mmCIF file of C-alpha atoms and ligand atoms in Angstrom:
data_model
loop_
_atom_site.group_PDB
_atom_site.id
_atom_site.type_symbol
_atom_site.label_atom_id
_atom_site.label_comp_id
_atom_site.label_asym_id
_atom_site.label_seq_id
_atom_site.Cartn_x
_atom_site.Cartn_y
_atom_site.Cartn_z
ATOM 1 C CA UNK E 1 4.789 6.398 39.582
ATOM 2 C CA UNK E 2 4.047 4.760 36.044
ATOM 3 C CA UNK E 3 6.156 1.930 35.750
ATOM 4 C CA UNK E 4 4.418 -0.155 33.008
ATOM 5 C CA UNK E 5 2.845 0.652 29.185
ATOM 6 C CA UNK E 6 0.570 -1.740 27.482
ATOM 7 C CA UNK E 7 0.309 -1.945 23.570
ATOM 8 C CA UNK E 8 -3.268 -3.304 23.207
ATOM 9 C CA UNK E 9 -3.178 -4.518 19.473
ATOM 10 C CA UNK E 10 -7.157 -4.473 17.692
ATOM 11 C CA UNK E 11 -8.994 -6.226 15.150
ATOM 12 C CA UNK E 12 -7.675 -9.299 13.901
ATOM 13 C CA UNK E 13 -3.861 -8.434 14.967
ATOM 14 C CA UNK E 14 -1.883 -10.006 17.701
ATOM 15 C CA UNK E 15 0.500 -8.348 20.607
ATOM 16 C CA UNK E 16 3.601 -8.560 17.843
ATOM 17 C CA UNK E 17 2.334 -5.937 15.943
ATOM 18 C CA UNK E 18 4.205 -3.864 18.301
ATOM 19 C CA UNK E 19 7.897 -5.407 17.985
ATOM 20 C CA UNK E 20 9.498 -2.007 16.712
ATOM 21 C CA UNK E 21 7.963 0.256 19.518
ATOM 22 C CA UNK E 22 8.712 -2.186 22.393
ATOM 23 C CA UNK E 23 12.359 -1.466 22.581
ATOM 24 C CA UNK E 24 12.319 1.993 21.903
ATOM 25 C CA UNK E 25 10.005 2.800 25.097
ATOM 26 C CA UNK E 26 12.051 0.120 27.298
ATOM 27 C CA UNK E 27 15.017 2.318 26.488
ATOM 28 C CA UNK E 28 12.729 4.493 28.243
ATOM 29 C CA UNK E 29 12.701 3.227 31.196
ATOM 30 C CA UNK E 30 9.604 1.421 30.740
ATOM 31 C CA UNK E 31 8.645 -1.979 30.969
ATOM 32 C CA UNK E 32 6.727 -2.832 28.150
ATOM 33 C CA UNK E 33 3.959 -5.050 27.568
ATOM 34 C CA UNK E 34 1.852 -6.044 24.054
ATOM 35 C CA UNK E 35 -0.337 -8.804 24.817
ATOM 36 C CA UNK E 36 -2.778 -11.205 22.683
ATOM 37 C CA UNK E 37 -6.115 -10.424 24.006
ATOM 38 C CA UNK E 38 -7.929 -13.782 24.335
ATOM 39 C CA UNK E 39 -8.751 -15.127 21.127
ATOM 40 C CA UNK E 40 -5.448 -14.216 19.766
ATOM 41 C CA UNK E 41 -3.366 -16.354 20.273
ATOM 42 C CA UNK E 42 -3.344 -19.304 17.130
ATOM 43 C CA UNK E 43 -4.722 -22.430 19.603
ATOM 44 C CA UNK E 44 -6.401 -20.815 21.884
ATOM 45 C CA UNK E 45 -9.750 -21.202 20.878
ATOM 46 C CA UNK E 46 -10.194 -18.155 18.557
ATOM 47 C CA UNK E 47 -13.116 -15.994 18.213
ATOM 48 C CA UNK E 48 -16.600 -18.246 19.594
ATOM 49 C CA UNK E 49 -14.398 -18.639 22.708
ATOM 50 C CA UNK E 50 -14.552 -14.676 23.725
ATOM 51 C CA UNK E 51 -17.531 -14.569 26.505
ATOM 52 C CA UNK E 52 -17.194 -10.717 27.141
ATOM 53 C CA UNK E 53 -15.053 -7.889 27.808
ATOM 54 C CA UNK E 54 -13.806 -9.182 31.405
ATOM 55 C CA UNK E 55 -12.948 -12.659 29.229
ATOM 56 C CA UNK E 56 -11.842 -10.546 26.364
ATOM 57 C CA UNK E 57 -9.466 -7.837 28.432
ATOM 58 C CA UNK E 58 -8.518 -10.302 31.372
ATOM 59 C CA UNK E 59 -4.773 -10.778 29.695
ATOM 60 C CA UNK E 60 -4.053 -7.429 30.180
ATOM 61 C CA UNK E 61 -6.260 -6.630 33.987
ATOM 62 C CA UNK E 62 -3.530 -9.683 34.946
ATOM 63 C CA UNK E 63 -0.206 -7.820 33.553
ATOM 64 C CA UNK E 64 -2.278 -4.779 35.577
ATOM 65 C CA UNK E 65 -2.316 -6.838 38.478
ATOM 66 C CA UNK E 66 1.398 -7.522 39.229
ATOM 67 C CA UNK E 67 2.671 -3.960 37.982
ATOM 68 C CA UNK E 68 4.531 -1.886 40.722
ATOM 69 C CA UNK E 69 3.282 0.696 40.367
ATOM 70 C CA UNK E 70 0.834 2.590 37.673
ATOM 71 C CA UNK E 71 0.176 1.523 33.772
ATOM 72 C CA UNK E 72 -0.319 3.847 30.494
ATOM 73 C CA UNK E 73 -2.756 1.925 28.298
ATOM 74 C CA UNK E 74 -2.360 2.186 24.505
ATOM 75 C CA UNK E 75 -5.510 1.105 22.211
ATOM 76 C CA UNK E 76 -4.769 0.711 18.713
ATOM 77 C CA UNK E 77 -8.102 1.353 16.289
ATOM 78 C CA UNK E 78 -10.928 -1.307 17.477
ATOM 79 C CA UNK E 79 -8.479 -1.796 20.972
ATOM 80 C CA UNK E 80 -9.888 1.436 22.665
ATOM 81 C CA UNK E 81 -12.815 -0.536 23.590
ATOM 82 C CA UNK E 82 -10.712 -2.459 25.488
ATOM 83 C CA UNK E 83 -8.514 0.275 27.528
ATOM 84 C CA UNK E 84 -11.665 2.367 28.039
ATOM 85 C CA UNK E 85 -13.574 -1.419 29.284
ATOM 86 C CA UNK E 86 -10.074 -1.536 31.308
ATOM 87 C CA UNK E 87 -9.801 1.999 33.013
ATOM 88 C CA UNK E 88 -13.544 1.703 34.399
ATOM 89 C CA UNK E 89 -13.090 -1.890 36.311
ATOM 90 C CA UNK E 90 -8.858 -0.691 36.886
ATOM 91 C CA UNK E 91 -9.217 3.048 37.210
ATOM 92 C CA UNK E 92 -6.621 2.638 40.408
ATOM 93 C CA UNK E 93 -3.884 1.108 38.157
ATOM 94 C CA UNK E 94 -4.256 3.369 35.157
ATOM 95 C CA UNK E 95 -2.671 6.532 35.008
ATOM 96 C CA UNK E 96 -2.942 7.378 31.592
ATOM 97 C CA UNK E 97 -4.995 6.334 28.466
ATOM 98 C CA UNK E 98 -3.768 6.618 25.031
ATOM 99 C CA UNK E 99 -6.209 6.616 21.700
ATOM 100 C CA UNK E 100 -3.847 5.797 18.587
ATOM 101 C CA UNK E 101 -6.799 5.979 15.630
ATOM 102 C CA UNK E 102 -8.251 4.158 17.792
ATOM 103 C CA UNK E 103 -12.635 3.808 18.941
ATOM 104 C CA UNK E 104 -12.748 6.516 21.334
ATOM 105 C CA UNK E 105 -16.504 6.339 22.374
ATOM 106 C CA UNK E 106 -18.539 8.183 24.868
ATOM 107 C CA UNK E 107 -19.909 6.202 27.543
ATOM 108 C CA UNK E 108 -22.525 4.229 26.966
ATOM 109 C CA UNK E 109 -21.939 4.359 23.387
ATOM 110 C CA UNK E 110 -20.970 1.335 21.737
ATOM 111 C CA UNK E 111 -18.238 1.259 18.542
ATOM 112 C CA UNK E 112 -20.826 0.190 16.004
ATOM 113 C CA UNK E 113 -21.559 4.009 16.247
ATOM 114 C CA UNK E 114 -18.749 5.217 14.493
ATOM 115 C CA UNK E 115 -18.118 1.853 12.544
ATOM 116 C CA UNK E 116 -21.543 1.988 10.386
ATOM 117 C CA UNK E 117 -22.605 4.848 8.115
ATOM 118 C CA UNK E 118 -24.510 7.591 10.165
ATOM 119 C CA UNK E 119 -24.484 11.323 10.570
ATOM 120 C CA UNK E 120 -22.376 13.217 11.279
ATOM 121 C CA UNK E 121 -18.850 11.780 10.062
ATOM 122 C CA UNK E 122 -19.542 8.459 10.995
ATOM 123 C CA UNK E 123 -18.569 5.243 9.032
ATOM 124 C CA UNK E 124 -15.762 3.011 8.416
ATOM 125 C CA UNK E 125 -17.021 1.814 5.117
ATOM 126 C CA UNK E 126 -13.548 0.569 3.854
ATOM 127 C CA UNK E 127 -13.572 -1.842 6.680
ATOM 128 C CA UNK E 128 -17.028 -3.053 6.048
ATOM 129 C CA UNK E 129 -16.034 -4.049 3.021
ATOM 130 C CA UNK E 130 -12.744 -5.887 3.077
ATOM 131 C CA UNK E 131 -14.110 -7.147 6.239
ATOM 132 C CA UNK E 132 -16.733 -9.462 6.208
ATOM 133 C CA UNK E 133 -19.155 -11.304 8.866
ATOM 134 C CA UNK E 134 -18.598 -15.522 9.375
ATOM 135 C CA UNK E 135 -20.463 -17.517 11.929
ATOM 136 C CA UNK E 136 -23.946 -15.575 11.919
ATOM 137 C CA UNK E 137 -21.996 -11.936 13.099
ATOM 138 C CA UNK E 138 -20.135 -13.754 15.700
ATOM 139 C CA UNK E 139 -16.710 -13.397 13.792
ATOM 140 C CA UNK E 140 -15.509 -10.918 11.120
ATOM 141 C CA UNK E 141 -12.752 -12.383 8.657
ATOM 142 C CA UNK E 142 -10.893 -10.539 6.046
ATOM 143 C CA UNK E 143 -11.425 -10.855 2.090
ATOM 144 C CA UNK E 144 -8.585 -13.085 0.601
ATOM 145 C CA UNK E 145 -10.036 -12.537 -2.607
ATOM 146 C CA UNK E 146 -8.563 -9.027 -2.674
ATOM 147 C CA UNK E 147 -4.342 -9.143 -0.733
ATOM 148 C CA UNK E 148 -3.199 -6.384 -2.490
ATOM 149 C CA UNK E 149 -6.261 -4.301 -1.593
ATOM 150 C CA UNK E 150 -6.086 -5.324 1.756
ATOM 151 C CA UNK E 151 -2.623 -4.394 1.971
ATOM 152 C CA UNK E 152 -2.570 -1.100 0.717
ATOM 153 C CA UNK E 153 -5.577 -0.301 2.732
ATOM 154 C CA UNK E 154 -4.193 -1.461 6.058
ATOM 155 C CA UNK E 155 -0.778 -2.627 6.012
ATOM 156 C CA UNK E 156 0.314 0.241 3.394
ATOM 157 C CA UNK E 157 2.384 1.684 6.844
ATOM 158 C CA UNK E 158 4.978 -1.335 6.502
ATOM 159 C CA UNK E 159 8.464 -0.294 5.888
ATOM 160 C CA UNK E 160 9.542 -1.915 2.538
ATOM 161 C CA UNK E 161 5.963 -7.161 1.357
ATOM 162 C CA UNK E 162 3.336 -7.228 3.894
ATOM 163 C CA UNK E 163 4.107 -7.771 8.213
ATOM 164 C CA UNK E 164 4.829 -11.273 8.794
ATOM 165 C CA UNK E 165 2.334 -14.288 9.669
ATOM 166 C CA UNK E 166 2.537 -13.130 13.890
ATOM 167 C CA UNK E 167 0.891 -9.921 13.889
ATOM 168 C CA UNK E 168 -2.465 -11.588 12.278
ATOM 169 C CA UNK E 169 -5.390 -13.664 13.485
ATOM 170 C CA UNK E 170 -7.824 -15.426 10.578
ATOM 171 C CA UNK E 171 -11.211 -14.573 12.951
ATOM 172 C CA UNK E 172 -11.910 -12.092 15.016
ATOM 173 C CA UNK E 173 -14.583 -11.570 17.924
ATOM 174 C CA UNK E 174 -17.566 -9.020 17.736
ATOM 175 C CA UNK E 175 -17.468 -9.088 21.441
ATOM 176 C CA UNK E 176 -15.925 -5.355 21.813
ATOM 177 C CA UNK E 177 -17.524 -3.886 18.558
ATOM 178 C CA UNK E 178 -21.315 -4.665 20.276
ATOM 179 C CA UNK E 179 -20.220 -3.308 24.193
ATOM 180 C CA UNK E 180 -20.409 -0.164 25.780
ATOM 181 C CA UNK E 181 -18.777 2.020 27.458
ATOM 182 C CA UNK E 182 -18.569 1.323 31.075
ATOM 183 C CA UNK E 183 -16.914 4.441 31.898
ATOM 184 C CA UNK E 184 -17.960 6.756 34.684
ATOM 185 C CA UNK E 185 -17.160 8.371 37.894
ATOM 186 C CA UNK E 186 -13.053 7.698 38.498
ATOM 187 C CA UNK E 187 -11.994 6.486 34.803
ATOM 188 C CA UNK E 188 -13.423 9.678 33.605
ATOM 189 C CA UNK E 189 -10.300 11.345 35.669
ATOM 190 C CA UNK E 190 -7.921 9.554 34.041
ATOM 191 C CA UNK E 191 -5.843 11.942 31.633
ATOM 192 C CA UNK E 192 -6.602 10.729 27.960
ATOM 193 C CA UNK E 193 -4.733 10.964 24.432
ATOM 194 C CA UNK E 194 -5.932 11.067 21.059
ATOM 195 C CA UNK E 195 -2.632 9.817 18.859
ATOM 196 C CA UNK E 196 -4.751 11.001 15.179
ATOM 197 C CA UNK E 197 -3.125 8.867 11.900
ATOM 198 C CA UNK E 198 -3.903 12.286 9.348
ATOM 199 C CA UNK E 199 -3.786 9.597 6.268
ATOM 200 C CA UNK E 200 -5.868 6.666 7.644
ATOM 201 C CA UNK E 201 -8.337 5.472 5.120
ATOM 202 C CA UNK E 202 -9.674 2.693 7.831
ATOM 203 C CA UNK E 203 -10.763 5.254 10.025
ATOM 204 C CA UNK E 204 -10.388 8.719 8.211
ATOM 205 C CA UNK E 205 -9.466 11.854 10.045
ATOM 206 C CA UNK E 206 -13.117 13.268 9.913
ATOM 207 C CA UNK E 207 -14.148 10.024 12.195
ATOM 208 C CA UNK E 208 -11.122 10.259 14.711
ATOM 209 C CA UNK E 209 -11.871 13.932 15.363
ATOM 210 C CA UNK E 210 -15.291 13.690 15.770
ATOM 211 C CA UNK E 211 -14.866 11.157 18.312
ATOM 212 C CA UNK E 212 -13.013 13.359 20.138
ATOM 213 C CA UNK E 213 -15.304 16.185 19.520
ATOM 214 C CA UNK E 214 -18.027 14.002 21.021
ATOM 215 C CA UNK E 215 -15.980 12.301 24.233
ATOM 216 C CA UNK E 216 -17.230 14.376 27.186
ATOM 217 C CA UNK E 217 -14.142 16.017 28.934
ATOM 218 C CA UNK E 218 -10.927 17.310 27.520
ATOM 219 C CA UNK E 219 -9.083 15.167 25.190
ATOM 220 C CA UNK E 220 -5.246 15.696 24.896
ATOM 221 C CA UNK E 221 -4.316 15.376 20.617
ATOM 222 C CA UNK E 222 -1.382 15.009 18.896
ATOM 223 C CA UNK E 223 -1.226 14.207 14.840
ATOM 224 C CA UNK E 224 1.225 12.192 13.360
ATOM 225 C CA UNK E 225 1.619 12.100 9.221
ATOM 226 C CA UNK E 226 0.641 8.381 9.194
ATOM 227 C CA UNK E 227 -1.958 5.820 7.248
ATOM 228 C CA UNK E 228 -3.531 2.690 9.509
ATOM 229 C CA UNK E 229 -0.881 1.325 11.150
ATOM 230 C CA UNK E 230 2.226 4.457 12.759
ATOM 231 C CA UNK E 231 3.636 2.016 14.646
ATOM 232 C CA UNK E 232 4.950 -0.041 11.162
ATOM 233 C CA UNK E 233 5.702 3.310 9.765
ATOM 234 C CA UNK E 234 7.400 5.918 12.591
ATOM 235 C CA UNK E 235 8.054 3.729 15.502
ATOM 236 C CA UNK E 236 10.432 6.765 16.526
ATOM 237 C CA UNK E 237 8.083 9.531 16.567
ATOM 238 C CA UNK E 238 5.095 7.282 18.023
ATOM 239 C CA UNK E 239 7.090 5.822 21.066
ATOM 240 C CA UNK E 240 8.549 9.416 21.513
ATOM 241 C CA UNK E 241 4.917 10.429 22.168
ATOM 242 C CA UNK E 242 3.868 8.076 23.984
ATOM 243 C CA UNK E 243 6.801 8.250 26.227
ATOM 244 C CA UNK E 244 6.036 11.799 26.670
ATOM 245 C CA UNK E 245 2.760 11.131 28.267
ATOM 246 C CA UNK E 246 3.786 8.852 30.304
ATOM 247 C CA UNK E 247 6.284 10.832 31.865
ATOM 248 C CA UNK E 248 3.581 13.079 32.822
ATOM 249 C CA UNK E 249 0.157 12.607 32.048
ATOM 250 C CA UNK E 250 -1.358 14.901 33.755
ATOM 251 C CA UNK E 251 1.052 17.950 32.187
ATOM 252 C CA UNK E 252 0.933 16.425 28.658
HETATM 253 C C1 8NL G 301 -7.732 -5.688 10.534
HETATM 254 C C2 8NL G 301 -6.341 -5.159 10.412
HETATM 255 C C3 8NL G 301 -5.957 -4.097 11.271
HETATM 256 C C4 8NL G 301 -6.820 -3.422 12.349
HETATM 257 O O1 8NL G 301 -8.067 -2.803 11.950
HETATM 258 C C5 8NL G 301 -9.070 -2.177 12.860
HETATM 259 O O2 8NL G 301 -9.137 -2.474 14.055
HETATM 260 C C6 8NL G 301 -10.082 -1.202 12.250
HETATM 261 C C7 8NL G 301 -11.474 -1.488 12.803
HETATM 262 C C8 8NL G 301 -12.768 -1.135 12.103
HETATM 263 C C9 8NL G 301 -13.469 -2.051 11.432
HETATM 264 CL CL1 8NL G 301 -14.993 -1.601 10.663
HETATM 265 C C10 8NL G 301 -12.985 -3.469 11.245
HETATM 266 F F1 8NL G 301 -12.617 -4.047 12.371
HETATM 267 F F2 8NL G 301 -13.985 -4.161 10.739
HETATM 268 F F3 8NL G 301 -11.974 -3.448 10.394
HETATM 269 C C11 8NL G 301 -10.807 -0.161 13.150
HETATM 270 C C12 8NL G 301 -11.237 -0.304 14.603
HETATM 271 C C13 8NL G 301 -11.418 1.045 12.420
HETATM 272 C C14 8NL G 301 -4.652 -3.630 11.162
HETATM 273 C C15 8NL G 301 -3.754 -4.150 10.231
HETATM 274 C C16 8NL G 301 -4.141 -5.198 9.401
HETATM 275 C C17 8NL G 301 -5.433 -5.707 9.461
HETATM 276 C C18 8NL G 301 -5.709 -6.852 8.501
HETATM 277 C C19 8NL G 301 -4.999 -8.029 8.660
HETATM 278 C C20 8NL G 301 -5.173 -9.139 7.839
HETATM 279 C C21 8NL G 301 -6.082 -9.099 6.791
HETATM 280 C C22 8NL G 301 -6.789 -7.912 6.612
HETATM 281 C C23 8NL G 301 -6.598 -6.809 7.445
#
């Protein structure tokens, strides 16, 4: 019944972030998708160019569209908005949704919740500050005055110097940092997955569980013993789980 997974890639990354889990979940069985969101792809207009979610997600609502049968969607960190947008307007073609550190928010709640400094366990202030606003808070950039702290802080997950120029955008879109959940009524049937990093300084533990803690419904966890980024550093283990669920989400 699920036929197709989608590796939704967040802030300021591209659909090649992905390259060493693809394979390993087409062995699978699965076809496997990682797109560029709009905005990501170098040429395409970058970040002013986003309108809103439906512009923002509408790469992956077309892979949705021609899929046999049902889809797992993946978020990575800032991509949750987008799979949680996604199941609410696609709830028919997703069967499963999977949270790796990724914005799990209640609906109606926005991401800026968990992103800015509030109570309790709230705040990605690591981000905040390697991150920083261009265009009047229409586009977030990174801080080249400081590579080596930006790579230990998020690319620190790469296997041997940093991932090469086609996982990375220069500007990203606040489009899916200011929206809010849309979810209600069917999406909020779909069986969901909390993949925790323990070691992520981007989004520390405390803030991934107590989105979870504050999702209403049962969320499914597993941990894995990874910083930022698992799918640079245990490709294995993360496609193994995600496999897993898709192969039964429901039972997982
Ligand atoms: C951004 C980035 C990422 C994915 O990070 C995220 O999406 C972070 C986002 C939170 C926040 Cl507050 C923010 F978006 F602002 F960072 C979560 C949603 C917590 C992964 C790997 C490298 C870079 C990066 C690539 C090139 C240069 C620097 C870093």
């Amino acid at each position: 019944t699920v036929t197709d997974i989608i590796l939704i890639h967040g802030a300021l990354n591209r659909g090649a972030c992905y390259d060493a889990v693809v394979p390993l979940l087409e062995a699978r069985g699965y076809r496997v998708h990682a797109p560029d969101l709009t905005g990501h792809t170098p040429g395409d207009g970058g970040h002013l160019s986003v309108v809103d979610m439906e512009h923002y997600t509408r790469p992956v609502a077309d892979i949705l569209a021609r899929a046999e049968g049902q889809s797992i969607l993946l978020g990575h960190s800032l991509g949750g908005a987008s799979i949680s947008w996604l199941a609410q307007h696609h709830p028919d073609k997703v069967a499963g949704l999977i949270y790796l550190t990724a914005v799990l928010t209640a609906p109606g709640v926005t991401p800026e919740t968990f992103v800015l400094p509030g109570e309790p366990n709230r705040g990605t202030p690591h981000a905040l500050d390697l991150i920083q606003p261009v265009d009047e808070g229409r586009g977030l950039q990174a801080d080249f005055s400081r590579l080596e702290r930006l790579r230990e802080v998020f690319m620190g997950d790469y296997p041997g110097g940093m991932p090469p120029a086609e996982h990375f955008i220069q500007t990203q879109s606040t489009v899916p940092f200011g929206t809010p959940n849309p979810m209600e009524g069917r999406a909020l049937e779909i069986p969901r997955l909390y993949i925790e990093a323990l070691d992520d300084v981007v989004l520390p533990i405390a803030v991934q569980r107590q989105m979870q803690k504050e999702f209403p419904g049962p969320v499914a966890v597993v941990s894995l013993p990874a910083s930022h980024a698992p799918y640079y550093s245990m490709p294995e283990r993360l496609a193994e789980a995600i496999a897993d669920f898709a192969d039964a989400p429901a039972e997982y």
